[PDB]
């Protein structure tokens, strides 16, 4: 399938959706979606892997290489993260964004 | 107002005027007349930080017709059930909530006020000053709603998923309008360019086209000081009425994230894409002796991430006693490098400030 031409939502509604043979469609059940999602995420990872090889390393990534192989700001930083985190009670934290959950409170 | 009446009169004329070689000049002028009027409506300390308190490093706006899908969406993204005010359609803006994603506080606003057919200008200003918009659609009936949402947003000078056009306009003294061209122009004639420039009462100028510019593109450039270019994500809810092949097909539409707010499908993707489009910059602080913490980045905005901005984000005084900064990362061309206040940082740079 590879690089395929892009479409508009208009094109999708008006012509593209109808090119599909309806009796061949795969139902979007919980099981079928999970299988599709599994492959979706795997492709992202493969796409990203290729981009990583070409992207300049981050400051974080650089230190990590250096690791694996004067101004005292403490007072100001401590205060900053305290301030930054003081209202945390009313704020949902997604952490690093992996495996989020979506429970509703109140 | 006469000024709001003047806009309708032009929209009306355009709709009943057929578009040909003979009418194109006039229609060009009409578009320009229309643009000028619409900017006058914005003319007045507005939007985020003024009309509502700014409560994150980024603020993100939701635009959609009232529905169970959209209420569940917001409730789910923010973790708190919709409040009394989030159900009123007379209400213009609400804050469904603030989230934290990869260390950044992101304010989430709902903007029902953009759809309504003093305070009306406040919702517009807020919309214009968001960092990213989510346009919420029901994939079973997307077109009507999409068309209205876009018209309303374009109408108030928001340009979704666009970079400013590559047109240079140098204003001249004598010799009228002169035009340069790179890629051949498939959409503008000289007549139409003159139509726009004269309507803008620009006697003489030199205009250089480095893009296959449309008449709107030219106007945008003329109106550059008030246009707000912003990422927008088309959130296509209700995929459970589709199928796998149909779902796959939606990914051929740029800036679309298909979801199901009931099932939670692709909410994770929605947030990932949001993060990607916001282009925030996490800086990791490192003291001379010890290592960087990586737990608590200072998060800076895309257009406000100078070493100067980093300093100020930490404490007002730092600039006064700043010698320089040691930086590892993609923002410097050698690892590490000493830099000055004006040095522009990049996501996940590691920084050690030094005392004068």
Residue numbers in the entry:
A (entry chain C): 214 to 282, 302 to 338
B (entry chain A): 2 to 45, 53 to 125, 131 to 369
Which sentences from the paper describe this structure?
The Developmentally Regulated GTP-binding proteins (DRGs) belong to the OBG family of GTPases (which also contains the Obg/CgtA, YyaF/YchF, Nog1 and Ygr210 sub-branches). In addition to the GTPase domain, these proteins also contain a C-terminal TGS domain of unknown function. The yeast Drg1 homolog is named Ribosome-binding GTPase 1 (Rbg1) as it was found associated to ribosome. It associates with yeast Dfrp1, namely Tma46, which is also a ribosome-associated protein.
The final model of the Rbg1fl–Tma46205–345 complex (R-factor 19.7%, Rfree 22.2%) includes two molecules of the complex in the asymmetric unit although the complex behaves as a heterodimer by size-exclusion chromatography. The Rbg1 structure shows a domain organization that includes the well-conserved G-domain (G1 + G2 + G3 = 64–169; G4 + G5 = 245–293), an N-terminal helix–turn–helix (HTH) domain (1–44) which lies adjacent to another domain formed by a 65-residue long insertion (176–240) between G3 and G4 of the G-domain and the TGS domain at the C-terminus (294–369). We named this new domain of Rbg1 the S5D2L domain as database searches indicate that its topology is related to the ‘Ribosomal protein S5 domain 2-like’ (S5D2L) superfamily despite the absence of significant sequence similarity. The two amphipathic helices, α1 and α2 (2–44), comprises a previously unnoticed HTH domain at the N-terminal of Rbg1. Tma46 fragment present in the structure shows a non-globular type of fold predominantly formed by α helices interconnected by coils. Tma46 helices envelops Rbg1 forming an extended and extensive interface (buried surface area in the interface ∼2978 Å2) contacting the G-domain (helices α1, α2 and ß strand) and the TGS domain (helices α3 and α4) with no contacts with the S5D2L and HTH domains. Our complex structure demonstrates that the region of Tma46 contacting Rbg1 is larger than these earlier estimates and encompasses residues 216–279 and 302–338. Interestingly, the interface between Tma46 α2 and Rbg1 α8/α9 consists mainly of aromatic ring containing residues, which form a π-stacking interaction. Superimposing human OLA1 structure bound to ATP onto the G-domain of the two chains indicated that the P-loop in chain A adopted a closed conformation where entry of GTP could be difficult whereas chain B had an open conformation.
